[PDB]
A = this chain, B = another copy of it.
Amino acid sequence: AEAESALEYAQQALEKAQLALQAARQALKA
């Protein structure tokens, strides 16, 4: 269970991260 719960959480974290990137990518235009 915990294994499948970490992979779910880690996916969450990864999707949170990709938000941050695209925002940062847009800012790089500025």
The residues of A with any CB-CB pair to B shorter than 8 Å are 1-4, 6-11, 13-18, 20-25, 27-29
- B14 in contact with A28 (CB, 8 Å): no
Main secondary structure on chain A at its contact with chain B? helix
Q: How far is the CB of A7 from chain B (nearest CB, A)?
A: 5
Give every chain B residue within 8 A of A22 (Cβ-Cβ): 11
Looking across the interface, which residue of chain B has its beta carbon closest to that of A2?
B27
Q: How far is the CB of A11 from chain B (nearest CB, A)?
A: 5
Q: How far is the CB of A25 from chain B (nearest CB, A)?
A: 5
Looking across the interface, which residue of chain B has its beta carbon closest to that of A27?
B3
6 closest A-B pairs by CB:
A10-B20, A3-B27, A13-B17, A6-B24, A6-B20, A13-B16
